[PDB]
Design a protein around this nucleic acid. Structure first.
Ligand code: ZN
Ligand code: ZN
Ligand code: ZN
Ligand code: ZN
Ligand code: ZN
Length: 147
DNA sequence: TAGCGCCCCCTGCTGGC
DNA sequence: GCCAGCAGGGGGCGCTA
């Protein structure tokens, strides 16, 4: 924000409250992660990130879809899932204007369709070049009996 | 501080084409 | 094989009480 009073003494960012600067410095500069999982080595800057992480250990899925049986561990994942029902495609490739349901899909599109000289994968068993690593995985399972 | 969201990242698979 | 759809784990910030 323009007049944000709390300037970071280590980068160009500034914040409206000192609490926001404190948290930003923990994330980006000092890396103090006060909140520690008791079941693995995970630790986080914010407690809410620990709580979300714990749901991966327990399987808790608090956020139920009202149109199907899906339920998520994170409110945003449910909002992302609702795009499968609405057909919303919020992301647009600035180069060719194709639209996508997720931002990562769009980034991958730009890598595969609008980027010069991208390194490709190669099947060693049949001498086929494959663009995406996951499609090399599929090829190995489908054509070379990877179990 | 904890707590609510908003949103992006990276990963890696699926099935239509 | 190419492609966009689509979910899991996670980082970082906006904002408030
Ligand atoms: Zn900073
Ligand atoms: Zn853990
Ligand atoms: Zn649903
Ligand atoms: Zn494009
Ligand atoms: Zn092969």
């Amino acid at each position: 924000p323009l007049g944000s009073p709390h300037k970071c003494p280590d980068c160009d960012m500034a914040f409206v409250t000192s609490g926001e600067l404190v948290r930003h410095r923990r994330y980006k500069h000092t890396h103090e992660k006060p909140f520690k999982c008791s079941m693995c080595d995970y630790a986080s800057v914010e407690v809410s990130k620990l709580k979300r992480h714990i749901r991966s250990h327990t399987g808790e899925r608090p956020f139920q879809c009202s149109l199907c049986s899906y339920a998520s561990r994170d409110t945003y994942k449910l909002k992302r899932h609702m795009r499968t029902h609405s057909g919303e495609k919020p992301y647009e490739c600035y180069i060719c204007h194709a639209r996508f349901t997720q931002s990562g899909t769009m980034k991958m599109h730009i890598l595969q369709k609008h980027t010069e000289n991208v390194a490709k994968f190669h099947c060693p068993h049949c001498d086929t070049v494959i663009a995406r690593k996951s499609d090399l995985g599929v090829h190995l399972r489908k054509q070379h009996s990877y179990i």
